[PDB]
Design a protein around this motif. Sequence first.
Motif, PDB file in Angstrom:
ATOM      1  N   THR A 188      24.149  -6.689 -16.057  1.00 28.81           N
ATOM      2  CA  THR A 188      24.698  -7.061 -14.768  1.00 28.81           C
ATOM      3  C   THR A 188      24.264  -8.485 -14.356  1.00 28.81           C
ATOM      4  OG1 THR A 188      23.768  -6.420 -12.561  1.00 28.81           O
ATOM      5  CG2 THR A 188      24.020  -4.638 -14.165  1.00 28.81           C
ATOM      6  N   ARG A 189      22.968  -8.778 -14.420  1.00 30.09           N
ATOM      7  CA  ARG A 189      22.476 -10.139 -14.141  1.00 30.09           C
ATOM      8  C   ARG A 189      21.826 -10.746 -15.391  1.00 30.09           C
ATOM      9  NH1 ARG A 189      19.796 -13.873 -10.064  1.00 30.09           N
ATOM     10  NH2 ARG A 189      21.133 -12.713  -8.596  1.00 30.09           N
ATOM     11  N   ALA A 190      22.126 -12.008 -15.692  1.00 33.02           N
ATOM     12  CA  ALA A 190      21.450 -12.700 -16.799  1.00 33.02           C
ATOM     13  C   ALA A 190      20.126 -13.328 -16.324  1.00 33.02           C
ATOM     14  CB  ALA A 190      22.372 -13.755 -17.427  1.00 33.02           C
ATOM     15  N   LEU A 214      30.503 -19.759 -16.336  1.00 29.36           N
ATOM     16  CA  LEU A 214      29.543 -19.674 -17.428  1.00 29.36           C
ATOM     17  C   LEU A 214      28.999 -21.046 -17.778  1.00 29.36           C
ATOM     18  CD1 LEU A 214      31.248 -16.982 -19.645  1.00 29.36           C
ATOM     19  CD2 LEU A 214      29.069 -16.689 -18.426  1.00 29.36           C
ATOM     20  N   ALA A 261      25.065 -22.126 -17.469  1.00 25.09           N
ATOM     21  CA  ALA A 261      24.355 -22.693 -18.612  1.00 25.09           C
ATOM     22  C   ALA A 261      23.766 -24.067 -18.310  1.00 25.09           C
ATOM     23  CB  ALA A 261      25.264 -22.779 -19.820  1.00 25.09           C
ATOM     24  N   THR A 272      31.591 -11.850 -13.703  1.00 21.61           N
ATOM     25  CA  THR A 272      31.011 -13.105 -14.149  1.00 21.61           C
ATOM     26  C   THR A 272      30.221 -13.759 -13.018  1.00 21.61           C
ATOM     27  OG1 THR A 272      32.833 -13.405 -15.730  1.00 21.61           O
ATOM     28  CG2 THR A 272      31.362 -15.277 -15.355  1.00 21.61           C
ATOM     29  N   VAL A 290      28.627 -12.128 -10.827  1.00 22.69           N
ATOM     30  CA  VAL A 290      27.396 -11.370 -10.710  1.00 22.69           C
ATOM     31  C   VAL A 290      26.473 -11.708 -11.859  1.00 22.69           C
ATOM     32  CG1 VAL A 290      26.281  -9.052 -10.648  1.00 22.69           C
ATOM     33  CG2 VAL A 290      28.402  -9.422  -9.339  1.00 22.69           C
ATOM     34  N   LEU A 291      27.044 -11.894 -13.053  1.00 20.09           N
ATOM     35  CA  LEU A 291      26.270 -12.258 -14.265  1.00 20.09           C
ATOM     36  C   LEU A 291      25.506 -13.587 -14.098  1.00 20.09           C
ATOM     37  CD1 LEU A 291      27.680 -12.256 -17.948  1.00 20.09           C
ATOM     38  CD2 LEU A 291      26.671 -14.159 -17.030  1.00 20.09           C
ATOM     39  N   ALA A 292      26.121 -14.564 -13.421  1.00 21.75           N
ATOM     40  CA  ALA A 292      25.510 -15.882 -13.252  1.00 21.75           C
ATOM     41  C   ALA A 292      24.228 -15.756 -12.465  1.00 21.75           C
ATOM     42  CB  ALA A 292      26.457 -16.836 -12.577  1.00 21.75           C
ATOM     43  N   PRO A 293      23.121 -16.312 -12.996  1.00 25.41           N
ATOM     44  CA  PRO A 293      21.815 -16.250 -12.323  1.00 25.41           C
ATOM     45  C   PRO A 293      21.805 -16.961 -10.976  1.00 25.41           C
ATOM     46  CG  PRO A 293      21.622 -17.231 -14.496  1.00 25.41           C
ATOM     47  CD  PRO A 293      23.064 -17.039 -14.276  1.00 25.41           C
TER      48      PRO A 293
END
Lengths: 169, 167, 170, 169, 171, 169, 170
Positions: D167-169, E35, E39, E66, E68-71
């Motif tokens: 879910t989170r990186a 993304l 990065a 995506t 949510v995935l992004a820090p």
Amino acid sequence: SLTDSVYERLLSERIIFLGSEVNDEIANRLCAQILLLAAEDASKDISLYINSPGGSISAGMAIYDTMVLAPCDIATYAMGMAASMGEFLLAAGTKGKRYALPHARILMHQPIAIQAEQFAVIKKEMFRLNAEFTGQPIERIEADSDRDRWFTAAEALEYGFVDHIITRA
Amino acid sequence: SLTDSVYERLLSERIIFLGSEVNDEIANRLCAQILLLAAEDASKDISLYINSPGGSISAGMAIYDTMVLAPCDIATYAMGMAASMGEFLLAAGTKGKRYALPHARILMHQPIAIQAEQFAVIKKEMFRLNAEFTGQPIERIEADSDRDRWFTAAEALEYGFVDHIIT
Amino acid sequence: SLTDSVYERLLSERIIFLGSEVNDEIANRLCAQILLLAAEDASKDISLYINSPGGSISAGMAIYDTMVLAPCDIATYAMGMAASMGEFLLAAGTKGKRYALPHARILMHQPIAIQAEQFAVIKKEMFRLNAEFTGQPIERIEADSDRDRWFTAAEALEYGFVDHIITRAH
Amino acid sequence: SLTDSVYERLLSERIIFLGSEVNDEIANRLCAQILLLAAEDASKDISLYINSPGGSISAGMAIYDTMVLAPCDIATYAMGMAASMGEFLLAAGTKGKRYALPHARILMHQPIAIQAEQFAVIKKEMFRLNAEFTGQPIERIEADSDRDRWFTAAEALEYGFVDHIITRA
Amino acid sequence: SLTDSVYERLLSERIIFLGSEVNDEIANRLCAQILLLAAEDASKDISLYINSPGGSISAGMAIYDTMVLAPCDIATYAMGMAASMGEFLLAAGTKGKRYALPHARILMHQPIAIQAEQFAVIKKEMFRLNAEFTGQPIERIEADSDRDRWFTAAEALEYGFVDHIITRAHV
Amino acid sequence: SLTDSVYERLLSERIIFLGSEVNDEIANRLCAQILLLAAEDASKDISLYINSPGGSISAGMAIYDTMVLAPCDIATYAMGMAASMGEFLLAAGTKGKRYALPHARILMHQPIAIQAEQFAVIKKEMFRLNAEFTGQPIERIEADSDRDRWFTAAEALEYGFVDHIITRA
Amino acid sequence: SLTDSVYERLLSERIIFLGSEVNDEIANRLCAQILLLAAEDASKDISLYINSPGGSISAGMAIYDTMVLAPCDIATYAMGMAASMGEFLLAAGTKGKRYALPHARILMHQPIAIQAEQFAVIKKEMFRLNAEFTGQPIERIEADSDRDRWFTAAEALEYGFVDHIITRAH
């Protein structure tokens, strides 16, 4: 594109091409190039290589006006064919610096009320100037245009279109 | 484009290509490249790689005249097919620097009043030069052009279109 | 474009691609790349990745000549399909450096008077050379071409088209 | 274009996308990218993001073969849809490094004489490799493909397509 | 092109646009940009400006995952229209960093057997998350969606789609 | 392309153009440009040249909101035509820095149940804002729009769309 | 492209072209180029080269206004044709710096209730400004326009459209 890149690199060598029929667009593109070269250095020669079936008198005449405007010498080269306005532009190069390659060919050619007035005036100017370029009488220029006279490189030298036949540079 | 990028990069190695039919456009392009390379260095060889089915006599002669005009040597290479005006250009390279690759083929071929006049003289002047290039008599050149004579690399070396086969 | 950009950067790693049918334009572009890389450095290997239905026999023969002409090794790799001239160019790679990816397919196929003459000459020479590349007799190459024999990666190794099958990290 | 520019910039970060149907042209571009990345640095991971309705087994299998050839790890991410050969390439990622985003979906799909023969061979190979990827028996894979079985991220994790739901990186 | 060069330059300021309908192509290009930005720098905000009439749920959910995935935080800005999945993406921004411009408009909207099973599942989930984003009960989201309820900036603030209405930025 | 290259270089001078109909696409591009300029430098003016026949109130409204959002002043210049949403955006420039060129013209104009609802509130809001830009009563804005009232530069200054007529910069 | 980089490189020499019909799009690109050059250096001349059949009266007046706006001199050159608004813009260049090439042609021409009103107004200005550019009375501008009077370069110098005819190195 590769082609364009090569032309632009030649432009840096002060070398330009008239490689198609002379029309309004090509005239614009070519006047632009002459102006650019004159602007970037007024004293270094420009080399104009010609392989052109020619075309519109007004279009060719604008290229001519710009050759005159440019302070630097314009060497001209009959590289393949110089026909109609292509021949005229060849003959308009700086005297002493007009060249034919050995297998070049030079062809002469004779190309609404207001249009007819304008065309009559520019046509007469073309003959007058063709006479100055070659040293021929105007009447000889008209007659030869009328019968589509063409010339080998040697014949062209003899007639007055060019000053030299060049084989090796 | 990638393909234009490669040909550009080859230009810097003084290598050029005739990879298609010779017409006015291609003749212009090819004359421009020769002039450019001659302007950049009048004393380094140019290499011309040829894979071409030929085309118009007048267009090929402008290329030829530019080839002669360049002060630098022009090495020619038959890479695949050198037919008609492509055979002429191959055979036009600097004597001693004309090459065929082992599987290259060489093909000979014959390609309104005022138009016909000019064609007659340029056609004759092309046979004349082909004879000079190869050391064959003008009559053999005409007869062989007529019948569309073609040549393997070995046969081309013997006839006089090239000086070396490179492997 | 992104695609062209990627092929250009791969050219910097001396990797080149034959990913479409072999015709004159493609052959030209490919000999140009080989010459370019040969001129930049004559000592380092070139890698040719092949995913191609093949095509013109004379076009393919020009590429082949340019391979032989290059002073450096040409590694060849069968990526997806190597058919007709694509099979020929794969087998023409420097012996020891010919690879198949495991799901590659290698296909053999049988590939105006004056055109026919030249074709007969070129065809015989292709069979001769393919025989040499694989170690098969000339008649086996002929009959296998006639019946459209195809090969998995494994069958290609056994027959002589390649030296290695990349079934793990290379 | 901007689109191509972001993809290029992403290559520098060792990220690649499968964002459309798998076919011969797409396979070429992707194989190319993997090769480029592997050549630049054999020791850094590559990240493959997948949002794909799958496509040709042949083309998918070329990408798979390149993944194997690549010495570096390949991490895979089900970004939205991983169907058919998109499911395949996902499950083909380096074990320990296959991921589903929380709302990803995973679709299984069952996709002249000698074309049929090439097809039979490569199809058996797909089932065999999907079995190895997932830890499932081939008979399960066959039946599940037959009936277009689909999966939420959690279900896909249980089945063995991915190793983590991220879910989170 | 000028337009692309402008968007690219904006990319350097960490600014991204959703300026058309949400489809697969657009989803791919937005996820790509998120993304890239994550990065380049995991610790700096991304700003997402929205002017979009919405579109496909599954395409919108891929952008959401995506995000949510992004820090890093994603700040969202309703620039003209935020409808349907554009409303959902707006509402999904990092809490405290969802903004409406004063004349923005927010629109709610309700968008083979196996295809139907999948749509039923993501429709439900979309409502669940819209409820979580706004603080509204699921049954209010569903009914408002049904009647195509729309909001001025002030009404969107009160409903819970955004955290700020901003007229003038600071320096 | 040349055109794009000049518009780009003009962007470094902090100069943007609205030289076509206002629709969503152009609204996006223009918002993008303002947002970029404010991001590079929130203290330097932006100059917006207008030659536009107007268009969508929505689109026009999004551009307006971005103009106000930008911390820097925005000078507007009516370069040829400022009609409808073009007039609106002209009048929306930072007060004291709205300009007509001497031969510019300003034209007023007025431009599914749920779509009608939205249109009614933004139309009303546009008239309100136009009344505040100009200092005219709302009923006169409404009336004049309804009859397509147009203005020379001198008449536009008098009415309140602009603050100055510039001849030389 | 070749052409575009030529036009761009010319921009670095502060030289612009009007080589087509005047319309809104072209007017926009031309005003853009002027504002660019003005912004780059407010104290060097701009050279406008004109080969144009003219076109919209509105579009031409936007170009004119922008040339007046620019704090630098704007030299103008009739390169091939200058007709209708093309003639106008030529005649509008800084006095002392308007040029015709010798074979250039200069042409005059006569150029919904709401559009008629606007048009009547621009038309009157156009004639008025044309009269002051040329030093010619308004009646004469009007009559010449409605009989489609055309001029050679030499006739254009006499009438007041240009100050110089370039018959030798410039």
